[PDB]
Design a protein around this ligand. Structure first.
Ligand SMILES: */[SH]=c1/[nH]cc(C[C@@H](C(=O)O)[N+](C)(C)C)[nH]1
Ligand SMILES: [Br-]
Ligand SMILES: [Cl-]
Ligand SMILES: [Mg+2]
Length: 425
């Protein structure tokens, strides 16, 4: 039936390839959130992330095999309690994984003893869990927060129904058109950004928690981006951090994470409180956004490289990805980092619950193509949405020189004098 591994045995196996240490806690605890008040947040060094809440996913066995977890591997599960990994161990044993052990002493033994190595997402407090947002709006004391004023922002693209059909209590909505211009789909000018943030009640010293709602985008609609709300949320996070909002948060997973926790929702139309001054020059961090001239300079630079976060059909020129762009092709010289199925999904950068994919798997995929934190990188896609999320992931890992090429394929292909390749490489 069972098998236990002690702290002594597990420590002498952290480098072994045939053992797979599996963290069954939440992805937010995996990244470094001290969800139980532990003195050290994060995961055991070398652990893979497989939250036990995914056991209800009928694709659980495919998620396991997409993580290269093979039946001949020595499975080592752990969590906050050994009872957390019991239903996952049985789930493995019935599917042919006969070598399955459970590590009992991750908390407080492994966490409360510095001799045991742990790892965490370097900027994890920017990727907040649902419990953190609940305590924030409830006035309760929470870690990783020490501010007076905050604003929860529900993001969407010309679809206020996404906000009115159910949102977080006290939350105000923000159309993506408040921060990006429809003529270029780039960030707005500083004066427009200053005026837009003030009429939403955002100052430079205001903590902004951003999130969106996944509403199953279909490529047959007029505005599929009106259903990819959480992508626009991270897209708005990049713009605010570019503008100068010093403390910007993102609810990991979006509206799905709020309802999964079981918290109350509101359907009210909360009015916007206005603030008279933003209080900081815009943009305060202009290095986060590059334009077309510097993007062309980064292609020929040995120190730089562009990252194409688009789908494979767009990359080979089969489709343009959008119903308002007609030219198909790819920018020559960029490194391909596939986002997923189409222009409104991020399968390769997300779990099924829309939380950010295990960042180690993101680093390993990026590393195989030469995408490393030593370079100055500018992520881009069609118009900057999918590139903003890829940039946010690299920002969360503490990469020192990452940016977004706002123009993307939209601005690039609009100039006939700009080159582009097509077809399979
Ligand atoms: S990178 C690309 N993927 C989605 C979006 C949003 C886009 C759309 O809805 O097509 N705009 C909101 C119009 C910019 N950008
Ligand atoms: Br989304
Ligand atoms: Cl491209
Ligand atoms: Mg743009």
């Amino acid at each position: 039936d069972h098998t236990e591994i002690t702290t002594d045995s597990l420590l002498a196996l952290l480098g072994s390839e045939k053992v797979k240490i599996i963290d069954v806690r939440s992805a937010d605890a995996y990244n470094g959130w001290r969800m139980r008040g532990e003195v050290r947040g994060g995961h055991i060094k070398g652990a893979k992330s497989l939250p036990a809440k995914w056991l209800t996913d009928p694709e659980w066995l495919n998620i396991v095999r997409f993580k290269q977890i093979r039946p001949e591997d020595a499975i080592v599960l752990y969590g906050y309690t050994p009872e957390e990994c019991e239903q996952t161990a049985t789930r493995f044993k019935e599917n042919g994984y006969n070598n399955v052990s459970v590590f009992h002493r991750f908390h407080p033994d492994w966490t409360g003893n510095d001799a045991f190595p742990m790892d965490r997402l370097e900027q994890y407090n920017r990727l907040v869990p649902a419990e953190w947002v609940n305590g924030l709006i409830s006035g309760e004391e929470i870690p990783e927060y020490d501010n007076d004023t905050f604003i929860v922002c529900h993001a969407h693209y010309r679809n206020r129904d996404a906000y009115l059909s159910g949102h977080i209590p006290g939350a105000t909505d923000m159309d993506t058109l408040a921060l990006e211009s429809p003529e270029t789909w780039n960030r707005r000018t500083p004066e427009e950004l200053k005026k837009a943030l003030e009429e939403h009640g955002i100052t430079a010293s205001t903590t902004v928690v951003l999130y969106g709602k996944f509403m199953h985008p279909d490529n047959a609609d007029e505005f599929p981006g009106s259903a990819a709300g959480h992508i626009g949320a991270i897209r708005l996070a990049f713009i605010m951090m570019y503008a100068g909002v010093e403390d910007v948060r993102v609810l990991n997973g979006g509206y799905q994470s709020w309802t999964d926790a079981g918290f109350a929702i509101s359907k009210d139309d909360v009015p916007k409180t206005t603030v008279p001054e933003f209080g900081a020059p815009i943009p305060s961090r202009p290095e986060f956004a590059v334009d077309i001239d510097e993007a062309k300079e980064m292609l020929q630079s040995e120190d730089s490289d562009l990252v194409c976060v688009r789908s494979y059909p767009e990359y080979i020129g089969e489709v343009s990805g959008f119903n308002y762009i007609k030219k198909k092709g790819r920018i020559p010289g960029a490194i391909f980092a596939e986002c997923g199925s189409d222009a409104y999904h991020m399968e390769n950068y997300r779990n099924h619950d829309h939380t950010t994919r295990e960042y180690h798997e993101i680093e390993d995929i990026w590393a195989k193509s030469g995408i490393i934190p030593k370079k100055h990188l500018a992520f881009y896609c069609g118009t900057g949405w999918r590139g903003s999320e890829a940039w946010f992931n690299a920002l969360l890992m503490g990469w020192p020189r990452v940016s977004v090429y706002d123009g993307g394929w939209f601005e690039w292909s609009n100039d006939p004098e700009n080159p582009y390749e097509t077809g399979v490489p």
